[PDB]
Amino acid sequence: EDQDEGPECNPPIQTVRMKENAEVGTTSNGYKAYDPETRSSSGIRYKKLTDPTGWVTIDENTGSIKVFRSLDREAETIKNGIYNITVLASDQGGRTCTGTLGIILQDVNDNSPFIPKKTVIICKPTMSSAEIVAVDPDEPIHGPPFDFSLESSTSEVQRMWRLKAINDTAARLSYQNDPPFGSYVVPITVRDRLGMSSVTSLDVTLCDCITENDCTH
């Protein structure tokens, strides 16, 4: 009669693939410890060891991966779309085996655009405008074209400015109604190609210049 002997946990290293928009608690196919006698490892329970992100948890019964807190592909903890977590199996004979679970992460468009440069000069004696350019940190299929506007701003601020588009990534902000030399705030709204939305408040000095770039000192 059969008795429950030791696990042959090969391969060392395993992989799964996941997608960024994954709901909290969702479960999918997972890491295994192996048990050749029974050709199945049905007593054998699972925990996680070290994790860079804290996004997933491992379903103890089955060794399945499940979401715990929501993902990002735009984070610095990914490289070439991949991260890894370390895994342990626990046996009621007083035994263990160990391994790695890699997690390949498909981007979806979820991040909005941001502004690299929010501080801008308008040299009034030769210029009416300054350019406003953005970036979006999803894939290049998942960002531009951007749709800019003065949407979020006030009816007083809208009476001093006009905004117009100039590229897939850019627009140009212009003064109206002879405003005086000085410094000013402008809220922009920007959406990306699927309508992901960002708010951002610009710094706009309108001044007198030599270089036509920065203000006379």
Method: cryo-EM
Q: Which two tokens stand for residue 47?
A: 């925990």
CA 25 – CA 36 distance, rounded (Å):
31
Q: What is the DSSP letter of 214?
A: S
* CA angle, 13 then 18 then 24, to 5°: 115
Strand partners, 87: 48, 99
Map residue 108 onto helix, strand or coil: coil
All residues at 6 or more sequence positions from 118 whose CB lies less than 8 Å from its CB, including other chains: 200, 201, 202, 203
Map residue 183 onto helix, strand or coil: strand
Beta strand residue intervals within the chain, DSSP E: 13-19, 27-28, 45-48, 56-59, 64-67, 82-91, 95-106, 119-123, 129-133, 147-149, 161-165, 170-175, 182-191, 197-207
CA dihedral (192, 136, 151, 145) positive or negative = negative
Q: Tell me if 134 sits within 8 A of 169, measured CB to CB.
A: yes
Strand partners, 183: 205
Q: Tell me if 163 sits within 8 A of 171, measured CB to CB.
A: yes
Resolution in units of Å: 26.0
Strand partners, 148: 190
All residues at 6 or more sequence positions from 86 whose CB lies less than 8 Å from its CB, including other chains: 48, 49, 50, 51, 98, 99, 100, 101
- The phi, psi pair for 25, rounded to 5°, reads 85, -15
CA 43 – CA 33 distance, rounded (Å):
10
Strand partners, 84: 102
| Cβ atoms within 10 Å, residue 66 | 16
CA 18 – CA 44 distance, rounded (Å):
24
Q: Which two tokens stand for residue 135?
A: 């970036």
Residue 33 backbone class (left: φ over 0; alpha: ψ -120 to 50; beta: rest): beta
CA 33 – CA 9 distance, rounded (Å):
5
CA 108 – CA 58 distance, rounded (Å):
23
